[PDB]
Write a protein that binds this ligand. Structure first.
Ligand SMILES: Clc1cccc(COc2ccccc2CNCc2cccnc2)c1
Ligand SMILES: Clc1cccc(COc2ccccc2CNCc2cccnc2)c1
Ligand SMILES: Clc1cccc(COc2ccccc2CNCc2cccnc2)c1
Ligand SMILES: Clc1cccc(COc2ccccc2CNCc2cccnc2)c1
Lengths: 396, 396, 396, 396
């Protein structure tokens, strides 16, 4: 059992383990595009000796955090352990090697999407975004008198074929991802993959349509089996007007009984309707997970709420140092100290606070972060809150 | 079609309309207890002429709002319109009469639980608490190393018969309701009803058990049909330790596959587990709805977040006045003005902000409140936030 | 194995066989009321020797046929064969004895409700009414501009407790049953049973309500498990206005998603709505079955359509005689003949034609009645049609 | 927003709107065949300005009505409104333009299949045929002793590959469509489409088989997911013997538990079995909708029942003229008059009467047609009845 960077000769063993580990992995063409995002030395394999029994890698991503700050981010992906090689510490060894490489390379954060909720907390990843599925019974849906774009005259929204408006989608998404915490840069090769998945599949997904506004798009397809359900795969709106105009068009899908979307907890959709209850939360789950690799670099990089007055404290991360933390005028300074800790928490907890998806008060009540000062808790809650609701860009 | 306060002679017609309108209304004994909470002149009936074709009433309640302030609250309840008398403006007429009586009597707020989401917004009620159902697959549930009360030795929690510990439940609930926004005083007659519903029913609900801690209780019963589901009807914990100790005991129900509870969005339960995902959000809905009857009395009564610096603005409520609003040191002053409005919203929107369940930013993005100042929005969001998460006491 | 009229001593053995044969038979009190309708000599039992292994009986009923003619009718009921005594010709022997007694007593017709569709055709019973279940999604239901009773002002319909308006229900039903083919006289003891079943049952059916109009009533109850379904057990309307007024009230049950009723194929309900499709046929089945005991007495008793000109033919019933049949001015004369048959059919087929539920043309296409004259077929179709749609009164 | 006949350049915008509006529309090849049936000027588009936001067209069809009379019929089809352009009166404008063109061209009737039941009544279309799904549990099915073709010896029915017997299917269907009200001429291009859909589809429908008799065929395929269900897509029988012989063969599909077919309410199938109840009505819905474009041309074209004696009345269609209507010897004369109306109804109601699927008495009880004469009602019922049951040919 060696742990090595793979050679070109290891990739067929990796594609077999991938096919056996992930139902979405059709074959080598499935990894082509993603693989242009893996740097040299971004991948490890475990061999028996020899055949591939374990693999993991990271992609070079750009993640938007509160204050519209974009961080270089190591996106852990393609992590699999052969069903023959369970319980042999292979995931631990692969994550320790990649974390060493990611830290040495200068990434301040790593990120992933978790197949299960119980695996990555012990490696320092905290869930940092929340997926919220809304299902609208569009047959009862009426827009509130206050809702934007109720005026008579031309619609600002067009129904279009996705592949014919790639430039517009790219430009709208680039604006969206730079203004929203959770935003990811989407490289050309991932736009190629997204547009390929928009075509009908022989006995698979139905054809995707787009609704296009100058300041937003929705990409939607009818469910393969439930022919009265439209699933909105993606909806990116840069203005409130674009968001409302797109939902007026989706609620105009008169063939459908139900429109479903995976969105975030602060989606204003329900408030656009005379009956907020028509926007049923049908599913909730963790989205993006974060591991803070460098505590001071990460805490100083993000912007903080201007509404909390200057304060200083001492934060200890369980295996990640102790720091004098001063937050004022929306900026943090975070410097080494041996002064007594006023706040303690594990690395994963800081990841869960970092984008504003989880309140410090909520984690304190679970004893995941410890402090004897209730005032300090309220100040942390207020300071780490994000003005712009955190959203989830796209899985990887 | 007259609208009158009912006489003793009207109540049998009211019990018939009740039985036909609400599946939970077994008969007159169903209204006995609740009815001690209806003041003189708290009830209206509509007669055809004569028989009862419409009814509505309010109960005298005490509602806890942020800052642990308790307001006299008119709880609208028993609102029904005969299926023969639909679309005749009877609900509008009954709500206008009760609102006149409630305002003249000096209540600063009214409240209700809505049978449907599309009815009460137009009468000025906004949804103000959020019910969140969590279903735990307790067979996988393990407590995080950080979770309180993991030590060996005696359990602080006892399994008890509800009717034998009424005094302890009352005392714990009284402490809970005074510290949590959404808390309601629960009078003796509602404790009598709650303890009666704890007994097994011939071909109905199974027997209720209690888990009792010095600082919390849970009341739970196995589902009538799904014998592997335990439903926690109520869980009131005054400390984090009590909340964790009670959940350790509920996860010790080894007969069960699943524990379900109707809780609030900030329930720390998920964070107590090594897998946060085991705490599935299976259902979300509006809980308590508020109508602000007197804008200045309500805005001055509640406490505001100390973390936002002093600010002044001009708020117009659509049919509810215009006010100079100054918020600093956790207190608001709210005085008449004809100065230009900086913020506008309908009455229902203010009700939805009032307990901190909905952010001003979220309602602004839906255009339910209008302002041209993004700084003012962030300040409102921060000021109206509740330190203690808003919860739902009990339906009425 | 003797076949005898039962003595008082046989009835406990009969109640045991009943309880084991019919899930609805709670105990002796279940047969008390019905049993006042069984004449002396209306019952047979088969004993092993001794214990009751077979039973059958008939009740004295009054059945309305086209032309508003009321016939004395033998209602076969309480027919059971012990599961130990299957395939021993016991049903055949019991039906031959009762048919002899019914014929000798002077009944022109027998009738029953069939537990299964494959049993009674061979004993000469044809299905003669059609049960049609309509389920309305009342949330979309809007009344057509043409629909009666759309005017503003008092409703002619009242919501009432069934037991307090027994006199009105009785009078409306008596008018209904005399004007509709399929109508049955409902004696006092069956009104006692109907009103008893209207009360809530400990872990059984929910309480029944009534909607009362001067010229119609509906009796409805919410489903025991599906709390958004109202089931209309009975709806008797003497005028079109009463039928429309009652459906406006049922569609005013705003708590409900769906209203279901067992009605007949010509129920005008769908045509009252702007969307006829909201009235989904969810179930169809045979209702009342008829055996014509005396062919000439039955054919001369009913009225025929005035719109077909006088015609004469020769009808042979397979074991029931050959007859010169002359139909004109809405009356038939039906006299013995040995002239060549122009129409042939079995006894059950005549029962299926007799109330107008089945067309002669439809039965001819299945070869259940044979004729070489297509003109004679059209004339029979037209003559046996019922002006007033055939309905089903109540099961027995 | 212009409304224009489309140019060749408009058809790609029309195919996109089609793909987004109808799940069955795979792509341009889906409209090729149908489109040979659209005359010059048979199509309208609505453009924003430009892109296609609305479309509708009619095909040249031949519809059989009672008396075996074949009418030129405008079949409205391909009607779609972009989800972005809802509630802008686009369907009303398109239907008014096509109705003007259809009337000017000399069609006496228009027809369509409705996506929803609440849309087309207001444009004068009444539902005129009734789809009736029968599901047979073929494991219990036994043919009645009376049923044709029970004799020993060769079967008159063969199991065949559809594509190898196109000539026989065409000839049988041509005979069927000329003798049955609801029959449509099926042009060569629709036989090409039907035979293409008979082949297995990669992850779609299973292969179709045929059962072939000299005087009838059935085309059936096993359900894609329920492998014990055979769905009969089409069954066309010119004689009762052919209908019975085909059902004996379908009930010989010993692999299957259930045979389902979409048929008409007078299908004799149930009467062929010893248990009529084995033929469960599992679904009922409107089929073909009719708009009478020229009242006198339509009323004079169809044949009427010979069994009703000569009568005269005055019929007013709400926006369609008033007429002296005389019906005798199976023929109507229908001439302009200003004499007082004895019968009134909207245009859609006449469409619903026209093929005999709905009785005048049933529509009168819903107040959809008004008369003060009950004798006149019975005469209309009898006169508009169809000797041959109305059936549905094929959707368009
Ligand atoms: Cl060489 C390489 C590098 C990074 C990612 C991959 C592709 O991983 C796939 C591809 C298809 C299905 C499943 C997976 C693995 N699950 C995560 C994931 C990734 C991408 C899209 N959706 C989900 C290949
Ligand atoms: Cl005289 C009076 C005054 C106020 C409330 C009542 C009782 O109302 C009932 C009782 C039982 C079932 C349903 C309802 C009405 N739905 C609201 C509600 C109320 C109480 C408990 N759960 C739900 C009677
Ligand atoms: Cl002594 C006698 C005479 C005639 C009928 C009876 C009662 O028969 C019952 C009673 C309850 C349940 C089931 C049955 C039998 N199924 C037919 C039926 C009858 C009445 C009401 N619903 C259904 C008893
Ligand atoms: Cl250019 C033109 C003219 C007339 C009809 C069409 C095709 O319309 C299609 C084709 C496939 C699926 C759905 C539709 C529209 N729904 C009605 C329909 C029509 C034909 C077959 N089944 C249903 C194209």
């Amino acid at each position: 059992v060696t742990l090595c960077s793979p050679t070109e000769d290891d990739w067929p063993g990796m594609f077999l383990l991938a096919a056996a580990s992930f139902t979405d992995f059709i074959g080598p063409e499935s990894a082509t595009a993603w693989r242009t995002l893996v740097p040299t030395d971004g991948a490890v394999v475990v061999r028996d000796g020899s055949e591939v029994v374990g693999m993991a890698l990271y992609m070079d991503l750009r993640l938007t955090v509160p204050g519209e700050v974009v961080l270089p981010t190591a996106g852990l992906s393609f992590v699999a352990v052969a069903p023959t090689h369970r319980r042999r510490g292979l995931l631990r060894a692969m994550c320790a090697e990649l974390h060493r490489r990611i830290a040495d390379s200068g990434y301040p954060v790593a990120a992933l999407h978790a197949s299960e909720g119980g695996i990555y907390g012990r490696f320092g990843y905290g869930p940092a975004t929340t997926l919220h599925e809304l299902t609208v019974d569009r047959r009862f849906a009426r827009f509130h008198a206050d809702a934007p774009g109720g005026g008579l005259g031309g619609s600002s929204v067009r129904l279009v074929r996705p592949t014919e408006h790639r430039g517009e989608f790219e430009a709208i998404y680039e604006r969206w991802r730079q203004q929203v915490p959770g935003g990811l840069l989407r490289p050309q090769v991932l736009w190629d993959e997204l547009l390929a998945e928009a075509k009908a599949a022989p006995g698979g997904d139905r054809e995707s349509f787009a609704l296009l506004h100058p300041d937003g798009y929705a990409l939607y397809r009818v469910d393969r089996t439930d022919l009265k359900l439209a699933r909105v795969s993606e909806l990116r709106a840069v203005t409130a007007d674009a968001h409302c105009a797109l939902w007026r068009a989706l609620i105009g899908l008169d063939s459908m009984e139900r429109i479903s979307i995976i969105t975030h907890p602060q989606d204003p959709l329900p408030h656009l309707l005379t009956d907020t209850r028509l926007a049923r939360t049908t599913w909730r789950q963790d989205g993006l997970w974060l591991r803070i690799m460098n505590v001071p670099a990460a805490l100083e990089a993000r912007g903080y709420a201007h509404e909390v007055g200057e304060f200083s404290t001492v934060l200890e991360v369980s295996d990640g140092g102790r720091f004098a933390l001063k937050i004022g005028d929306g900026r943090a300074r975070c410097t080494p100290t041996d002064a007594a800790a006023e706040i303690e928490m594990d690395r994963d907890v800081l990841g869960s606070l970092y984008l504003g998806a989880h309140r410090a008060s909520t984690l304190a009540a679970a004893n995941r972060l410890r402090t004897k000062d209730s005032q300090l808790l309220r100040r942390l809650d207020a300071a780490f809150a994000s003005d712009v609701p955190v959203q989830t860009a796209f899985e990887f």
